[PDB]
Amino acid sequence: YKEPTPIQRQAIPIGLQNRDIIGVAETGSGKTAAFLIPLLVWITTLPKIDRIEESDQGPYAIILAPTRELAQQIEEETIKFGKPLGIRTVAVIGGISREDQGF
RNA sequence: AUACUUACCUGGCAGGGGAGAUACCAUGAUCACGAAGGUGGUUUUCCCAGGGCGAGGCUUAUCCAUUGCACUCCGGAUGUGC
Numbered sequence: 273y274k275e276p277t278p279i280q281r282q283a284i285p286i287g288l289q290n291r292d293i294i295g296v297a298e299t300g301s302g303k304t305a306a307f308l309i310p311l312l313v314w315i316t317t318l319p320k321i322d323r324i325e326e327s328d329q330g331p332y333a334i335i336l337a338p339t340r341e342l343a344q345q346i347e348e349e350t351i352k353f354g355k356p357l358g359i360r361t362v363a364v365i366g367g368i369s370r371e372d373q374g375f
Numbered sequence: 376a377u378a379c380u381u382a383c384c385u386g387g388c389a390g391g392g393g394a395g396a397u398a399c400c401a402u403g404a405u406c407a408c409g410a411a412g413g414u415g416g417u418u419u420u421c422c423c424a425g426g427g428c429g430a431g432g433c434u435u436a437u438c439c440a441u442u443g444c445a446c447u448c449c450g451g452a453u454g455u456g457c
Contacts, residue, residue, distance in 0.1 A: 337382090338381095338382075339381060339382050339383095340381070340382050340383075341381070341382080342382090343382085364383090365382075365383070366381090366382050366383030366384065366385095367381095367382075367383080367384095368383095368384095368385090369385065369386050370384060370385040370386070371385080371386065371387090372386090373384085373385090374385095
């Protein structure tokens with residue numbers, strides 16, 4: 273990602289203040305990274321003592337999409353950002369086996 | 376209702392008798408006439424599995440016939456289960 277897209281330029285700093293956002297822009301405009309980046313900053317800067325939890329307590333974040341097709345787009349991009357950072361992403365969507373999903 | 380599209384939930388794999396035997400047919404088998412066999416038929420014997428046909432018999436009631444002398448069951452009809 274060589275340069276921030278417009279939505280990224282403005283939404284990222286608002287997200288870094290923990291503020292809610294309504295972003296008006298269409299898919300293809302770099303929305304996904306705009307919301308992913310403040311989340312990754314937050315997660316990876318928690319103290320290790322605080323990133324510690326022994327029981328599984330579900331996700332730090334949920335990203336809801338209207339369609340399976342859009343959800344998968346988001347997933348692919350989330351993986352490519354999250355893996356290098358040791359951040360795990362799971363897709364709960366239709367068109368996939370419930371065994372695989374359940375697992 | 377039907378067809379497709381997207382999203383969500385779901386998601387094991389594999390099959391269709393078996394085992395013998397076949398002298399005969401095909402496979403016209405690459406070494407001086409030939410393989411054996413295997414494979415595919417055919418026929419047949421086992422292990423047998425599900426159907427078809429229902430002769431005969433068992434059981435019980437309505438109607439009909441019967442007043443009959445036997446000691447070899449045993450008139451007709453119709454219907455539920457066997």
